[PDB]
A and B are shown apart, each in its own frame.
Chain A
């Protein structure tokens, strides 16, 4: 018989014999991420090794079947992924050190505690504390201490580990027909089989820069408006021509400018679009947040959350009795098990991210019908963009009024929309320069364009030029500040978040055409529209099977990321920002530093 049919029965054996092995690893990994114990770290690692062993053996058997013979393209994708040699190309010397480093960096970031210089026994951890300091404090010194101490006491220790991480990871990617570890991540966006819908590793790197060029003007006026309004909040510390000190931004790294909304809110007297106060004053629970997000997906026709979701998920901090990984995580364990692990606090940020993570599950539930090796999103951005479609509709003041977090007699206004659009711009527009710089640094470091002696110089050289953020304190090469972020320290691709935002409005534009709309791209609550939901269901059901370019084309009408929908969503803000900067300087000077 045909080898293609011979390989089909090989994959049929693989799919049926792999689910339990992957399920056991997922169960153990869930039991450690929800319960930090040395007993669970061994059990989770053992199940991962058995899962990895099953991958290694079934990969070698998959090498025998040649891809060039197979003509069923969906079969070709499944065989192609299983045939790939990942860490298997590494020797036992290389694989152990690569994994020993990777776990060590995660444990340093997780167990990172900064002691108060006075009373050294008092230590502040990044997750419970030292983020409240970096997101609620208006003291320049308190923010400076938390920003510098984390990037020095925790970051410096990650500097030696990251250098060996790059060289070992590069050897893995270079061995497996890639230029560098950046190319290994960059292949996620590649299509090479269908005419007109093909893609390449470098087409991402050129489209990102072309699309970012049209985001820079909007960022400049957002920067200037924030700069002026931060100048009042922190007098005598910010230059009206210079960059923005890093610790004065929203969070520990400047990734999100959301927390700056209090200082930069245009019209304070208009009712707050930040319903964080309203939730707490109405005794909103963690359950209500995930239940309200459930009703949103139900209204557009998508299914209820499974009973395994409500029974088995962890939606609150378990307490000081048992530790947990409180990074918002969506789990597709398999076997119909869908769970969300999150340290939900009653804030608007966790309300929107609950919609984001339930968007992950809705995507995960839809592609469950597809085979195991096709059980994934079209690309990384697609998965993260699906959740953001919901949080884009859920954040609208009309939807907030619908759920009761805004007054029943709320009257829309020109001023309120600027209040709403600015807050959405701090979260969405603000992070785009941060993501472009962070991945460009990592992409170039993997390529070797940035030498090890010029690592930190380039990190803050680009942060000033691209993002407009300056170092509050001079930093040597001993510091390793890029690894002070979770995503860099835990070996995750970060360009997914930049591509996410451009997809998000492209989908919403099409979803808000199916749901008969009247006005602009904002005020786009797809809630109660079954047509909008079924337009997404078809994309979610495909998974990795169809190419991402084709998947995008059927939904929105284009084979590539288009920055135009994003600019139309924020167009009322862009024009308002330009007038609000008539007497302010737009742009930043690359040579101003607070320490100078």
Chain B
């Protein structure tokens, strides 16, 4: 005899406990559906440096229902975690990853260093320095196309043609501001269409059909 759960626990340990993350200019997006989501495990990890749930309730997030659940993951410097927030202007937010000013959901980050700054680092993360326009909310641009300062012929890396992408150099000796920080953003959303994920207690509230 076994206890059957028609909706398995949602894949939340996959995104957070993942071995490798992505550079901010190429952030990774995930859909969580056809499952039951316990957000208590997200609270129970006290190692999380920042748990900034704009909009929805922090600890009563578990006691809710949702339709569109998107999880975005990237790693940025500690002093740039503030730029991953509603209505904050900065090099990361303007050109790499922008949250809506009306955004509802949460931003989660932790210290990293242990894995993504290993002695003789095996990875290399990156970030975008220049762009013509500020990114609209939830927009991505992986363009490798060169940027011009004045009216410039940008076919060669030159005095005024600057390569748009730049590299993060994470070392143990770096300070907290210049140390890597792993950020996962949960983009909860509500749709008038039938719901997809609610929570453990609310298995029949809206998640099931």
9-residue interface stretch from A7-15, A264-272, A407-415, A459-467: A7-15
How far is A10 from B130 in the complex, measured between Cα atoms in Å? 11
- CB–CB B129/A12 < 8 A: yes
For the complex formed, measure the closest distance between the CB of A558 and the CB atoms of chain B, giving whole angstroms: 35
For the complex formed, measure the closest distance between the CB of A159 and the CB atoms of chain B, giving whole angstroms: 41
Q: Is A321 in the interface zone, CB < 8 Å from B?
A: no
Known A3-B150, A9-B130, A10-B149; judge A306-B166 contact (CB<8 A). no
- CB–CB B175/A306 < 8 A: yes
* Residue ID in chain B nearest A17 by CB atoms: B166
SS class of chain A's interface: helix, strand, loop or mixed?
A: helix
Q: Is B174 in the interface zone, CB < 8 Å from A?
A: yes
Q: Is B159 in the interface zone, CB < 8 Å from A?
A: yes
How far is A13 from B165 in the complex, measured between Cα atoms in Å? 10
How far is A549 from B157 in the complex, measured between Cα atoms in Å? 42
Known A9-B149, A336-B174, A337-B173; judge A61-B159 contact (CB<8 A). yes
Q: Is B16 in the interface zone, CB < 8 Å from A?
A: no
How far is A13 from B149 in the complex, measured between Cα atoms in Å? 11
Q: Is A335 in the interface zone, CB < 8 Å from B?
A: yes
How far is A12 from B95 in the complex, measured between Cα atoms in Å? 14
Most buried by A among B129, B160, B175, B179: B175
List the B side residues contacting A16 at CB < 8 Å: 129, 166
- CB–CB A333/B129 < 8 A: no
Q: Is B203 in the interface zone, CB < 8 Å from A?
A: no
List the A side residues contacting B178 at CB < 8 Å: 335-336
- CB–CB B129/A312 < 8 A: no
A interface footprint on B54-76 (CB within 8 Å = 1, 0 otherwise): 00000000000000000000000
Q: Which of B129, B160, B177, B179 contacts A6 (CB 8 A)?
A: B160
List the B side residues contacting A335 at CB < 8 Å: 171, 173-175, 178
Q: Which of B160, B166, B171, B175 contacts A10 (CB 8 A)?
A: B160
Q: Is A27 in the interface zone, CB < 8 Å from B?
A: yes
List the B side residues contacting A12 at CB < 8 Å: 129-130
Interface residues in B, total, Cβ within 8 A: 19
- CB–CB B173/A333 < 8 A: yes
List the A side residues contacting B179 at CB < 8 Å: 336
List the A side residues contacting B176 at CB < 8 Å: 306-307, 336
* Residue ID in chain A nearest B175 by CB atoms: A336
How far is A3 from B159 in the complex, measured between Cα atoms in Å? 13
For the complex formed, measure the closest distance between the CB of A26 and the CB atoms of chain B, giving whole angstroms: 9
How far is A27 from B171 in the complex, measured between Cα atoms in Å? 11
How far is A306 from B160 in the complex, measured between Cα atoms in Å? 38
For the complex formed, measure the closest distance between the CB of A471 and the CB atoms of chain B, giving whole angstroms: 48
How far is A27 from B173 in the complex, measured between Cα atoms in Å? 9
List the A side residues contacting B129 at CB < 8 Å: 12-13, 16
Q: Is B138 in the interface zone, CB < 8 Å from A?
A: no
How far is A188 from B150 in the complex, measured between Cα atoms in Å? 33
For the complex formed, measure the closest distance between the CB of A351 and the CB atoms of chain B, giving whole angstroms: 27
B interface footprint on A330-365 (CB within 8 Å = 1, 0 otherwise): 000101111000000000000000000000000000
Q: Is A476 in the interface zone, CB < 8 Å from B?
A: no
List the A side residues contacting B171 at CB < 8 Å: 23, 335
Q: Is A119 in the interface zone, CB < 8 Å from B?
A: no
For the complex formed, measure the closest distance between the CB of A428 and the CB atoms of chain B, giving whole angstroms: 34
* Residue ID in chain B nearest A7 by CB atoms: B149
List the B side residues contacting A336 at CB < 8 Å: 174-179
Q: Is B103 in the interface zone, CB < 8 Å from A?
A: no
Q: Which of B154-205 contact A (CB under 8 A)?
A: 159-160, 162, 166, 169, 171, 173-179
Known A12-B129, A61-B159, A337-B174; judge A6-B169 contact (CB<8 A). no
Q: Is A448 in the interface zone, CB < 8 Å from B?
A: no
* Residue ID in chain A nearest B158 by CB atoms: A61
List the A side residues contacting B162 at CB < 8 Å: 9, 13
For the complex formed, measure the closest distance between the CB of B148 and the CB atoms of chain A, giving whole angstroms: 9
How far is A5 from B170 in the complex, measured between Cα atoms in Å? 30
- CB–CB A308/B175 < 8 A: yes
Q: Is A153 in the interface zone, CB < 8 Å from B?
A: no
21 examples of A-B residue contacts, CB within 8 angstroms? A1-B150, A1-B151, A6-B149, A9-B147, A9-B149, A16-B129, A19-B169, A20-B169, A23-B169, A61-B159, A64-B159, A308-B174, A312-B173, A335-B173, A335-B174, A335-B178, A336-B174, A336-B176, A336-B178, A337-B173, A338-B175
